[PDB]
A paper describes a structure:
The consequence of calcium binding to the regulatory domain of APC is a stimulation of the substrate transport activity of the carrier. A structure of the regulatory domain of human APC isoform-1 has recently been solved, confirming the presence of four EF-hands, each of which is occupied by a bound calcium ion in a canonical pentagonal bi-pyramidal fashion. The EF-hands group together into two pairs, forming two lobes connected by a long central α-helix, in a similar fashion to the four EF-hands of calmodulin. The linker region between the N-terminal regulatory domain and the C-terminal carrier domain contains an amphipathic α-helix of unknown function. In the structure this α-helix is bound to EF-hand pair 3 and 4, analogous to the binding of a calmodulin recognition sequence motif to the hydrophobic pockets in the EF-hands of calmodulin. The protein construct used in the previous study of the HsAPC-1 regulatory domain was mutated at the extreme N-terminus to replace a cysteine residue at position 15 with a serine, raising the possibility that a native dimer could have been disrupted. Therefore, the mechanism that couples calcium binding in the regulatory domain to substrate transport in the carrier domain has not been resolved. Here, an independent structural determination of the native human APC-1 regulatory domain was completed, which was combined with an investigation into the oligomeric state of the full-length human APC-1 protein. Furthermore, an extensive comparison of the conformations of EF-hand proteins in the calcium-free, calcium-bound and peptide-bound state was undertaken, which has allowed us to propose a mechanism for the regulation of APC that is consistent with all available experimental data.
Numbering used by the authors: 21 to 174
The structure:
C-alpha cells in the first residue's frame, strides 16, 4: 500500500487533511490494529517533522515509506533462500548468525505471532502489513518486540 492515501483517509476522521493523536488512537483501535499509546506516540513524534502536533499526509507518507524500507531490509535480512518468504528454519538460522540460539518450536511461536492470515509462512506483503504501524526501526528492535510479544526466551 505504498501511496498510503487509503490509510490516511481512514485515519482522518473529521476530514481536515491532518491526523491528530486522537484520530490515530481511535482509528488504529477501530481498524483492529493492536498498538500501545507510547508506541503510537513514538510514531507521531518521529513523523511530525514540522512539530505542529499534527500529521499531514506528506509526513504520514514519508514516515510509512522510510519505515517500509527499514522493514524490507529487515525482511531480506531474514530471507536466506531468497524465495520471498520466511520459514521457521530461516528464523532459526538468521537468529543463529546473530549469536542467539532458539528452538524450532519457539520459532514456530514467533512465526505464528507475526502471521495474521492463515498462510503459515510470511511473505513480504504480510510482513509489511504486520509491521506497518509497529515503530520498530531494525531487526534488533524487531527481536526486542518479539521478546515482549511472545513472552519467550531471548
Ligand atoms: Ca483529522
Ligand atoms: Ca505536522
Ligand atoms: Ca523461507
Amino acid at each position: 500500500p505504498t501511496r498510503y492515501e487509503t490509510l490516511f483517509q481512514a485515519l482522518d476522521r473529521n476530514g481536515d487533511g491532518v491526523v491528530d493523536i486522537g484520530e490515530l488512537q481511535e482509528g488504529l483501535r477501530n481498524l483492529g490494529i493492536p498498538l500501545g499509546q507510547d508506541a503510537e506516540e513514538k510514531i507521531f513524534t518521529t513523523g511530525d517533522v514540522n512539530k505542529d502536533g499534527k500529521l499531514d499526509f506528506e509526513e504520514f507518507m514519508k514516515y510509512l515509506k522510510d519505515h517500509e524500507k527499514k522493514m524490507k531490509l529487515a525482511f531480506k535480512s531474514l530471507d536466506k533462500n531468497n524465495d520471498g518468504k520466511i520459514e521457521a528454519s530461516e528464523i532459526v538460522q538468521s537468529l543463529q548468525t546473530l549469536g542467539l540460539t532458539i528452538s524450532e518450536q519457539q520459532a514456530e511461536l514467533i512465526l505464528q505471532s507475526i502471521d495474521v492470515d492463515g498462510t503459515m509462512t510470511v511473505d513480504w506483503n504480510e510482513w509489511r502489513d504486520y509491521f506497518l504501524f509497529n515503530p520498530v526501526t531494525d531487526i534488533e528492535e524487531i527481536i526486542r518486540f518479539w521478546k515482549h510479544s511472545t513472552g519467550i526466551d531471548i
